[PDB]
Amino acid sequence: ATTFYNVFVKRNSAFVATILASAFVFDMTFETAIDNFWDRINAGKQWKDIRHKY
Amino acid sequence: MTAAEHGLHPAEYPWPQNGMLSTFDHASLRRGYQVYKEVCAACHSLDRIAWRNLVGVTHTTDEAKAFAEELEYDDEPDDEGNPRKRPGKLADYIPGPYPNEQAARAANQGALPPDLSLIAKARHGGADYIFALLTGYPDEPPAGVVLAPGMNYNPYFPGGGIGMARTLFDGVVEYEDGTPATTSQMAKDVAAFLTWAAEPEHDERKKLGLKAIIVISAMLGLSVYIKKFKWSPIKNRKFIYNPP
Amino acid sequence: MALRKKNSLLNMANSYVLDSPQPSNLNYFWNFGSLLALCLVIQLATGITLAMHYTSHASLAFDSVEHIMRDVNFGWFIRYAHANTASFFFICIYAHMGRNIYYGSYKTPRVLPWSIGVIIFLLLIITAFMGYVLVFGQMSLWGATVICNLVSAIPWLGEDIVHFLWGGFSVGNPTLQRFFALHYLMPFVLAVFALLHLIALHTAGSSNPLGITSNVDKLSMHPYYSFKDLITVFAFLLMFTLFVFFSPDKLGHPDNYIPANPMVTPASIVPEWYLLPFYAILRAIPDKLGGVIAMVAAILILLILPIVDRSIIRGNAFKPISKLLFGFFICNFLLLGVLGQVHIEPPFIVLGQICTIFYFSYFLILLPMVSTIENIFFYIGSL
Amino acid sequence: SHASLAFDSVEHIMRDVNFGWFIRYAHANTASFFFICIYAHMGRNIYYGSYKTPR
Amino acid sequence: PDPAIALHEAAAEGPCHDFKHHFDECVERVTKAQEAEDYDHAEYKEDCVEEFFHLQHCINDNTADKLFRVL
Amino acid sequence: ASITSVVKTSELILKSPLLSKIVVPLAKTYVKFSGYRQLGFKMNDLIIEETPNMQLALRRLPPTESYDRVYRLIRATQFSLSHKLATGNDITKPEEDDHYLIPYILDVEAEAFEKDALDNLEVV
Amino acid sequence: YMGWWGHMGSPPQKGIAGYTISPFAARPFAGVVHAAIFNTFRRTKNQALFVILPVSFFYYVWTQASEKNEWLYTKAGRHELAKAL
Amino acid sequence: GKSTYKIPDFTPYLKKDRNTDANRLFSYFMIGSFGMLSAAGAKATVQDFLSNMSASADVLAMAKVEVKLGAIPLG
Ligand code: HEC
Numbered sequence A: 001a002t003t004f005y006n007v008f009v010k011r012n013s014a015f016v017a018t019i020l021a022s023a024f025v026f027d028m029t030f031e032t033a034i035d036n037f038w039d040r041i042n043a044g045k046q047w048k049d050i051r052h053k054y
Numbered sequence B: 001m002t003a004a005e006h007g008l009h010p011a012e013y014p015w016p017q018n019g020m021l022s023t024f025d026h027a028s029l030r031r032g033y034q035v036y037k038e039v040c041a042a043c044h045s046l047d048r049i050a051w052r053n054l055v056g057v058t059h060t061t062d063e064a065k066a067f068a069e070e071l072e073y074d075d076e077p078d079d080e081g082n083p084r085k086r087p088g089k090l091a092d093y094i095p096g097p098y099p100n101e102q103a104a105r106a107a108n109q110g111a112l113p114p115d116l117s118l119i120a121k122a123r124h125g126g127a128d129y130i131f132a133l134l135t136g137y138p139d140e141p142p143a144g145v146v147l148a149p150g151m152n153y154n155p156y157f158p159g160g161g162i163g164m165a166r167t168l169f170d171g172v173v174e175y176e177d178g179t180p181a182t183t184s185q186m187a188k189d190v191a192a193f194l195t196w197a198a199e200p201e202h203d204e205r206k207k208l209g210l211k212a213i214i215v216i217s218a219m220l221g222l223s224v225y226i227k228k229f230k231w232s233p234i235k236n237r238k239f240i241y242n243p244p
Numbered sequence C: 001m002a003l004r005k006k007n008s009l010l011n012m013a014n015s016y017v018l019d020s021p022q023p024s025n026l027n028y029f030w031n032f033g034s035l036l037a038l039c040l041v042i043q044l045a046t047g048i049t050l051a052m053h054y055t056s057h058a059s060l061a062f063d064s065v066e067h068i069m070r071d072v073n074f075g076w077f078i079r080y081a082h083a084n085t086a087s088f089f090f091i092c093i094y095a096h097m098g099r100n101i102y103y104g105s106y107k108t109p110r111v112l113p114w115s116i117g118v119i120i121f122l123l124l125i126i127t128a129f130m131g132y133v134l135v136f137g138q139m140s141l142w143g144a145t146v147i148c149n150l151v152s153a154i155p156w157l158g159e160d161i162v163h164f165l166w167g168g169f170s171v172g173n174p175t176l177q178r179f180f181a182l183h184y185l186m187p188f189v190l191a192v193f194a195l196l197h198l199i200a201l202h203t204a205g206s207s208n209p210l211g212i213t214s215n216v217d218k219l220s221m222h223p224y225y226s227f228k229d230l231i232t233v234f235a236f237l238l239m240f241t242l243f244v245f246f247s248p249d250k251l252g253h254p255d256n257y258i259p260a261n262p263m264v265t266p267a268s269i270v271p272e273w274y275l276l277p278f279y280a281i282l283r284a285i286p287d288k289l290g291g292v293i294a295m296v297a298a299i300l301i302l303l304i305l306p307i308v309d310r311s312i313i314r315g316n317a318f319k320p321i322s323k324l325l326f327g328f329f330i331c332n333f334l335l336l337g338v339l340g341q342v343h344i345e346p347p348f349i350v351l352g353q354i355c356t357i358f359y360f361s362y363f364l365i366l367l368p369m370v371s372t373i374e375n376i377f378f379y380i381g382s383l
Numbered sequence D: 001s002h003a004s005l006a007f008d009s010v011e012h013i014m015r016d017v018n019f020g021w022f023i024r025y026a027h028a029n030t031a032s033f034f035f036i037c038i039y040a041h042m043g044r045n046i047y048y049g050s051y052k053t054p055r
Numbered sequence E: 001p002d003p004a005i006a007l008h009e010a011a012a013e014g015p016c017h018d019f020k021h022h023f024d025e026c027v028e029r030v031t032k033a034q035e036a037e038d039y040d041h042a043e044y045k046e047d048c049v050e051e052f053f054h055l056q057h058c059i060n061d062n063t064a065d066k067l068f069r070v071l
Numbered sequence F: 001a002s003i004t005s006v007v008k009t010s011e012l013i014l015k016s017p018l019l020s021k022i023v024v025p026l027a028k029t030y031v032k033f034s035g036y037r038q039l040g041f042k043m044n045d046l047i048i049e050e051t052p053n054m055q056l057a058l059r060r061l062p063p064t065e066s067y068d069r070v071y072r073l074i075r076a077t078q079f080s081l082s083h084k085l086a087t088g089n090d091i092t093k094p095e096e097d098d099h100y101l102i103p104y105i106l107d108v109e110a111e112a113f114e115k116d117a118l119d120n121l122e123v124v
Numbered sequence G: 001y002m003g004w005w006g007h008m009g010s011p012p013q014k015g016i017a018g019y020t021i022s023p024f025a026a027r028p029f030a031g032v033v034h035a036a037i038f039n040t041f042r043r044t045k046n047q048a049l050f051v052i053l054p055v056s057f058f059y060y061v062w063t064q065a066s067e068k069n070e071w072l073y074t075k076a077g078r079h080e081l082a083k084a085l
Numbered sequence H: 001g002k003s004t005y006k007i008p009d010f011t012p013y014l015k016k017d018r019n020t021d022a023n024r025l026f027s028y029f030m031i032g033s034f035g036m037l038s039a040a041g042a043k044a045t046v047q048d049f050l051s052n053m054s055a056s057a058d059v060l061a062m063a064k065v066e067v068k069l070g071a072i073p074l075g
């Protein structure tokens, strides 16, 4: 806990760097997660689901 | 105003795309395009839609190019400056049935069939209005209604007398996917299709809205924690007063 | 001395957004000022972006808006953001004005920020009206026709003035091009007046919900009100998101998706919802000129609140009768809004006349009477 | 601002708008005068050391 | 066969029977009134649009969901 | 409006037996519903002070009265921001709601109004 | 009428001691459940009439007007409409 | 009520572990999460919004002309 504080939080340069790197990871993973969820709730409805007939 | 003058308000039908998380049914969109092409396109244009707009929505790139290449469009003049035609490309807009308003009205006993590219947004009711209108021609006008010549009775249309006759009858279209082409089925499909034509961003818009809802909700929750945290020294302040 | 105070430029920012001393007890209704600043920023960003894709020629305007919706990447978002934020701008502005009337922000020593504010409100109306015309759909055209023919009621020169504003004998291309130029410009004027009313306010500072001095107990604007402003920003963006992404057309009128046709008149010419109360006031007076004067007076009468409020106490927090009267005033203002969109038919014609009388009589009769009587009740009641 | 109509709109200003010629030439020439004055103002500042502390 | 035909008939005979009767009574009156001479030179000619709207509005409320379920 | 006005009109009402019989009970209720006492204020703490006259009257308050007023304003502001009401001894009892400021502002205004009158005198 | 830090324009203050604790020492959501329920109830109850009375009155007015208007433009309302115009 | 050295009661609000690194770290996790979502949100906003300035679909449809070569004879 102290260790975590000292490394990622104490220096604002480190804190901002950690926030931005987290933002990058969140952005990438959230994109992927929403994509999959959207595809499941709208299953058989989207072009990707019917494309195979053509 | 009388209810007649307003038009009957259409029912709220449960469209597949109703629902914060719901896209269009693209198989219905494709079937709706086929109804447009075989029935409506006789009188109505769809001028805001290009062939490329169908691609990856209702048709593959090949199918759409095939549709475009069957038509002739005006080319740039040749080297002697004589006019020329070319086959259509994906960038071309779907061509209308009439050259101008005058020709359109002449073919329709004076009435001008509107362009259908925005009609789902340009009428109160949207898909429900289109569906109600196409399916709502009674066999006989209510006793006592006097229709003007060339008018048809339809209660959903304001005033009751519409210049467009009933056009959908069981089996006017033969769907390529084997779906029974009943009046109701065709109206549902074409209404879906026209709604897509008016708002083609609909599916993407609702997915981005879901992401925005989630992030903005989280930020709202966190913003409340941070506010309460920073304000606590002010809220918790205590005084002791000793009058001087 | 700290740089933020030493340097002249930094010091101006500092004095307004960081060290500015605020009352420690502002409630959430003091957050509409910053939401209005946010709306103004969103409208500038989306507005400038739409201007990069819009064509002001009447032969191409409507189609350019379709191009934005259909071809420009995220064009749909920019267009709907701009159109919906105009409605949110008026929700926030009515709230901000409501806050100011309820808490007596128009009283000395804040008459000047209030009076500049009344002009900001007029500029916003003009700005939003011109923007509505730029689409050049049926509501665009029929709006410009009817509203600019009100100017015809100005005696002697009125007709001449109309033709001069239109740039011709009807609403057409010249009208559209000049509304585009003015719609671009007006938001900048509006921003300057917004800044003037803040500079005027800086002499007294913010009022507060108790109506007493805050000189005894101040808080820096940052961090306390910075962080409190974030809550309403995210609440606003949630509402924005629900309209822009899920129901982008809920606040609007389908007729504007039909291209302008000078021949065909739409079923019903009703303005955008936020103009509806003023439209109801105009309909109430049968005379054309009378109606126009009434409609303008309905806005300019706000300038006399500093005179007609005779209370020795600032605001309504402690005044039960004034609170009731204010409730009725606000609800009547909403009923006027509703009557602005009904058909000119019985029994709404007479009802609109009664609501119009009530609107004016608040400023001219009731508020002066009620505020006088409450003064006497506070004195006798506390003896 | 449309490219199919821009040049023609400027001709419309020159030919059809009342005093359009004046407004167009005023705008175009004042842009040159703006730069004459700005070079002069900068020249003044450099010659008289207006860039030194505390300015 | 169009699914709507049967659903509308069922809703008219069932939950919208009172409205069906009103429309029917109206049509009887209007037809009879048109049958009588010097109807063309009358001041007020009655229609049945009001009753028709009441009926259709009712049928639609009882059918909308059912119909879209079978398409 | 001027405090002078309010005080004079009130005195006309309190003189008339009929008027006082109907107004004094109403005014007492009004004050109860107003609810400023539930924030520990005295009525006079609510009077608008950003006026030259009122600034002068406040400067003329005795130091003790002035110190107490500052505390009541700070205490009320704290209840306001916390969304709490006064409890116990913080609630202003009807007997504590004294017009500490009215005499000062009436003197300030008396002079101000005399000055305006005398600026318009005409030798006969 | 407002100064700046150091000379804000307060009457002289004397005799008030103010105390507070650090944001990091405090529970920011202390007693939130009690406040959310009991405090909101108190504050809402005290303001309810000032909202209910005007809203209920203007809603009643609108309801009566809209129902009359609807009735005047029916067949049954023909005669009353003729007089109203 | 009189002595100013008798600090008013703050026990309802005081955290027992107020001086621990765990305690500070929690609140910075909240602040940092908020900064993280704000950064991710601003990136998304900027990228989506500025993409309006990239070639629109109608423009992109006009480049990239495709031509057959089977039709073209030698010489
Ligand atoms: C041969 C003629 C013809 C065909 C076929 C036709 N229409 Fe029309 N339609 C018209 C005419 C004419 C009007 C204008 C009627 C009027 O305004 O009185 C019209 C009007 C409309 C309207 C607008 C009604 C309004 O509110 O203004 C919609 C929507 C519509 N048609 C959709 C369709 C659809 C969907 C189809 C077929 C799937 C279709 N039409 C087939 C001639 C046709």
Ligand code: HEM
Pocket (backbone or CB within 6 Å): C040, C043, C044, C046, C047, C048, C050, C051, C054, C065, C079, C082, C083, C086, C089, C124, C127, C128, C129, C131, C132, C133, C134, C135, C183, C184, C187, C188, C190
């Ligand atoms: C207070 C600021 C503003 C307000 C209230 C405002 C309001 C509006 C409104 C109501 C419309 C009609 C929207 C529609 O239904 O489509 C509109 C359109 C428009 N506005 Fe603004 N506007 C503002 C600022 C700006 C600014 C600064 C620009 C910069 C050019 C601008 C450019 C446009 C354009 C090009 C349109 C037409 C395209 C369209 O309709 O979307 N706006 N504006």
Ligand code: HEM
Pocket (backbone or CB within 6 Å): C029, C030, C031, C032, C033, C034, C036, C037, C040, C093, C096, C097, C100, C105, C106, C110, C113, C114, C116, C117, C118, C120, C121, C190, C194, C197, C198, C201, C205, C206, C207, C208
């Ligand atoms: C673009 C529109 C406007 C913006 C951006 C704006 C912004 C602000 C801001 C930031 C403040 C200080 C914070 C607050 O009290 O909320 C404020 C205060 C004020 N505004 Fe506005 N305002 C606008 C329009 C108006 C209008 C239309 C009026 C009056 C009709 C007005 C009158 C006032 C008054 C009187 C105050 C002082 C209130 C007080 O603190 O007691 N403003 N405004």
Ligand SMILES: CCCCCCCCCCCCO[C@@H]1O[C@H](CO)[C@@H](O[C@H]2O[C@H](CO)[C@@H](O)[C@H](O)[C@H]2O)[C@H](O)[C@H]1O
Pocket (backbone or CB within 6 Å): C005, C011, C012, C013, C014, C015, C016, C017, C019, C198, C199, C202, G003, G004
């Ligand atoms: C809100 C938008 C953000 C931008 C800020 C607004 C830009 C224009 C503001 C400048 C107008 C002049 O604003 C004026 O500046 C000076 C110093 O800056 C302020 O002066 C104030 O602060 C300084 C120190 O911070 C003190 O020396 C002074 O006693 C005090 O009154 C005035 O109170 C303010 O009225």
Ligand SMILES: CCCCCCCCCCCCO[C@@H]1O[C@H](CO)[C@@H](O[C@H]2O[C@H](CO)[C@@H](O)[C@H](O)[C@H]2O)[C@H](O)[C@H]1O
Pocket (backbone or CB within 6 Å): B204, B208, H046, H047, H048, H049, H050, H051
């Ligand atoms: C002040 C800032 C200065 C520098 C910032 C520079 C930013 C400008 C970059 C524009 C980049 C756009 O790049 C492009 O973005 C869009 C979203 O916008 C992404 O598009 C992706 O998501 C969008 C929705 O968000 C979907 O419509 C699309 O089907 C999907 O592919 C692309 O995958 C990416 O290729």
